[PDB]
C-alpha cells in the first residue's frame, strides 16, 4: 500500500491508452457507497470526460461519474443516469463527493462542499464487488475499450471510497481535509497500477 | 412526539402519491400565525410547486405558500393571493418565514433572514383550526386531489408554526437557529404521518 | 410626545385616503434644514411616490422628497427641483439624509451613508414655518388633495428633522444610529395624527 | 496661510466665471513634480472637465489633468498629451496622484492608490515656475479665457504638489492620509483667492 | 552583482531598440527549469508582446513566454508552443511562474499564485546553456532581430530562474515573497546590460 498524501496523478496529454487502475479489497456487494475525489481539467468547455469509471463483468458503467459538455455532471449507477446540471463553469480545481443508497435510491452530489439536491436513482439495485476501477478513461468493457474522446486530461487525486453513505457532517470534514478512514479505496493506503503516460506529481489544490 | 432536529424530509421523485401530513394540536381559530421552514429544490426554474399547504373543510387553500414559475413566492390566505416576486433565483437551500395578522391584514415574508415589504391580505378574516397540513403536495380537497405537477421535489424541514406574529428580532433568532418554542407546530415535537416515497435524512442546510 | 424608537409606520395598501401628519413646533422660518428618514417600498420599479412632503399655505411643495420612476430621487424646495439620478435600484430598506442651506443653496443628499455630489438649489430662499408635514402622500394643497398614484406603499420611519445642516461626521452618526438630538421634528418625541389605514409596527430595518 | 484640513472647495453650478486660484511660492523651474488631489463630480458621463490646470506665460496647458468623455483621464505637460483610458466609471469620490520627471519623461498616474502603467511624456522638457494654478476651470490664457463647458462641477480638495517624484511607498501614505509635507503647494498651508460662486465646506470623502 | 530588490525595469516607449540582457552563469544544459517574474503592461488588449525571451544560437525561441492577442499566455520550449488561454484580462500587475521538466514534459503555469492545469511539451528535449536572455523584446536571432511589434511596454521585475521545478509549496512562497534562492538567474544578485531607453525605478506592485 502506498500513501499518496499530497500527491496526484497527472494525465498531461489526450490519450486512449494512458490510465491507472485502482484495486479494491472489497469482497461483498455494495448496497451503498460514497466516493470523493479532487480533479482539475480545462476540458470542461471543450468536451466530456470520465472522472471515475467503475465496471463489472455484467455492466461497463456500474458506477460512472462523468462530465457532459454543456450539461454538467452526469452520475450513473447500473447504467441508469441522472444529471446534476451546471449552468456555468469556471476553471479551478473542484472537489466532488457522491453517494448512493440502494435501500432508498437517494443520490447525494456535493461540489466544493456545497450539496446538490438529493435525487432518486436505481433503487433496490446492488453494485457488484468484482470491479475494475479506472481513472483517466471511460471503460466500455471490463478493464478496456477506452475512447480517447472520453479520456480525462489534467489531474485527479484524493480518490476515497466508502461502502456506506457519509453524513453531511462527515462530508464537510472530507472537504476540509480532516481525519477520516475509507474502507474501499483509501488514498493514504492506495493499491494501483499505471499504464502509459501517467505521472505522480505534487497536487495543485491546497 | 418526535424530535426531528437535524433531520429533514426528502421527496426524491416526482409524484402525486407521496406526501407528509402534520398534525396540529390547535383547537381555537387563528387570528394570526407565523410559519417558518427550510426547503431545497431545483424545480424553481422548471415549474411551480407547493411549499406548505394548509386546508380546511370549507377551503382547500386556507394557507398556502407556493412558488410560481418565473414569478416568485405566492402567499395566499383564505384563497386570496399576493405575490412576492423574485427576479432571479439562486440554487441553494432557502429559509422562509411568513406571518399574517387578521387585525391588520399585514403580511410579512422573510427570505434568508431578509424581510420583504409588508403587504395587505384578507384583513378581518379568520383561519379555521380544523385543518389538514400537508408537505410535499398541494391539496385541492381537505386531504387529497393532489396534483403531481404541483408536488415538491427535494427537501423540507424545520417547519415551525406559531399562532402569533413573531417580531423582527425573534424571526432573526429563528433564522440563526436560536432557542425558540412554537405552539401550533413544533419541529422538535412533531406529530406526522408519512405516505409513499418519503424519507427522513440528515439535513443538507447547516 | 411618543417615543417611536424601534417602530415604523406601515402603509400596506395603495390609497389616496391614508396618511399621517407630523407636527413641528416651528416659529422661526427655516434658513436651512436637514431631514433624515428610513423607508422601504417595492414601488421603485412600478411608479413614483412621495417619500416626505412639506407644504405651506403659499406653496404645496415647499420641501418634497420624491422618487421618479427610472429617474431616481427628486428633491425640490420652494417648488423648484433637482434630480439625484439612480442608474439601477435594488429592493432593500434605504436610509436617506438631505440638507439645504439658503445662504449657499448647497444641497447635500446621502443614500445609505454614501454622499451624492453637492448641488445648488434656491439660493437665498426661505422655507416657511407655518407648515404641514405629511408622510405616505404628496400634498397638492395645504394638508390635502392627495393623489393615489403618488402615495407611498410600504414603510417609513426614523423621520428626523433639524433646522441646520448636519456635518458629514454627524450624518454618519445618524446613519449608524448614534446619539443625536433633532430640534424641528424628533422621532423619539414625535407628535402626529394618523388617518385611514396606517399601522405602527416593529421596524424591518436594523 | 490657511489650514484647509478636512475642508473642500465646492463648485455647485456650471459656469465660466467661478474658480479659485492657488499661489505657489516656487522660484525655480520644475524638473519634476508630483500633484495629488481629491475630487468628486457627476460630470464624468456627461462631459469632460478640468481637474487641475497649471499655466505659464508661454503655455496655457503647462500642466493639465483633464477628464475626457468616454476616454478617461488626460494628462498633459507642455501642451503634449497622454491618456490613461478608463473603460467604466463609478460615481464616488476619487483620489489621484500624478508625477512626471524631466530626466526620464516617466509619468506615473495613480487612482485610488492603484498605479497605472508608467508612460513617457516630454523627456527633457522644463516646466516654468511663473505659474497660474486654477481649480474649477480650464484656462486658455494666463489666468483666464475659461470655457464653461470645461468647468468642474462638484468638489475638489487635498490639492498637494511636490517638486519631486514621490516614491510608491510615499504615494500610499498620501492616499491613506499619513503625515507628509508638500513644498510647492500645501493643503495644510494654502494661499488662495476665490472668485464667483465657490464655497468652502466639510469634505465628503473620509 | 546588483541587488534589484524592490526595483523594476521600465520600458516606457514602444521601440525595436530598447532592451536589457541578463547573464546566466549556467554552464550545464537544462533538463528542467522554473522562471518567475512580475510584469505590468496595458498592451494586453492592444497587441501581443514578449514577456521573457531565452535564445540559443541553434534556436531563437528556446524558451519564450509571450502574450498573444485575445488568446492569452503562449509558452514555448524548443520552438514548440502551447497556450494557456485567458478568456478575459484585467489591467493590474501580474505574477507568473512557469516551469518545465524534460523527464516528463510537464509544464506548470501559475498566474498570481493560482495554478493552471499541467500540460505536456517537448518531452525528452534539453535546453541549451549557451543562451541570450532578453527582457523588453523578443529576439529572432541570438541577441537581435528584435521586432517593435513584439516589444514589451511597461514594467518587468523579480525575474528569477531555477534549474529545477519548484514544488507547489515553494511557488507559493515565491508569490508571497518569502526567502528563496535562485541559481540560474537571481534578482537579488543580477548581472545585466541595458540598451536604449530603459529605466530602473521603484516597483509598482507591492
Ligand atoms: C456519460 N455518457 C452517457 C456520455 C457515456 C456513458 O458511457 P458510454 O456509453 O459512452 O460507454
Ligand atoms: C394559487 N396557485 C396557483 C398556487 C394554486 C391554485 O390552484 P390550486 O393549487 O389551488 O389547485
Ligand atoms: C415632484 N414631482 C415633480 C414628481 C411632482 C410634482 O407635482 P405634484 O406631485 O406636486 O402634483
Ligand atoms: C486636450 N484636452 C481636451 C485634454 C484639453 C483641452 O484644453 P483646451 O485646448 O480646451 O484649452
Ligand atoms: C510564436 N509567437 C507568436 C508566440 C512568438 C513569435 O515567434 P517569432 O515572431 O519569433 O517567429
Ligand atoms: Ca462506458
Ligand atoms: Ca465509452
Ligand atoms: Ca389547492
Ligand atoms: Ca391543485
Ligand atoms: Ca404637490
Ligand atoms: Ca401631487
Ligand atoms: Ca488649454
Ligand atoms: Ca479650453
Ligand atoms: Ca523569435
Ligand atoms: Ca519576432
Numbering used by the authors:
A (entry chain C), B (entry chain B), C (entry chain A), D (entry chain E), E (entry chain D): 1 to 206
Paper text:
C-reactive protein (CRP) is a pentameric protein of 115 kDa composed of five identical non-covalently associated pentraxin domains. The B-face binds to a range of ligands, with the canonical example being phosphocholine (PCh) head groups in lipids such as phosphatidylcholine. This is a calcium-dependent interaction, with each CRP monomer chelating two adjacent Ca2+ ions. The A-face modulates many effector functions of CRP, such as activation of the classical complement pathway, where binding of complement component C1q to CRP is mediated via predominantly electrostatic interactions between the Ca2+-containing globular head domain of C1q (gC1q) and the A-face of CRP.
Maps corresponding to pentameric CRP were solved with both C1 (no symmetry applied) and C5 symmetry. In all cases, applying C5 symmetry yielded maps of better resolution, corresponding to 3.2 – 3.3 Å. The increase in resolution upon map symmetrisation and high degree of similarity in the resulting maps and models strongly suggests that solution-phase CRP pentamers adopt C5 symmetry, which is reinforced by the low deviation in the angles between subunits in the C1-symmetrised pentameric models. Within the structures obtained by cryoEM, five intersubunit ionic bonds contribute to monomer-monomer interactions within the pentamer. These bonds form an ionic zipper from the A-face to the B-face of CRP. Upon the addition of PCh to the CRP pentamer, Lys123–Glu197 adopted an intermediate bond length of 4.6 Å. The addition of PCh resulted in an intermediate ionic bond length at this position. Hence, two factors that are known to prime CRP for complement activation, pH and PCh binding, appear to effect this bond. In all maps of pentameric and decameric CRP, clear density was present for two Ca2+ ions, and in conditions including PCh density for the ligand was visible and adopted similar conformations between the cryoEM derived models and those found in crystal structures.
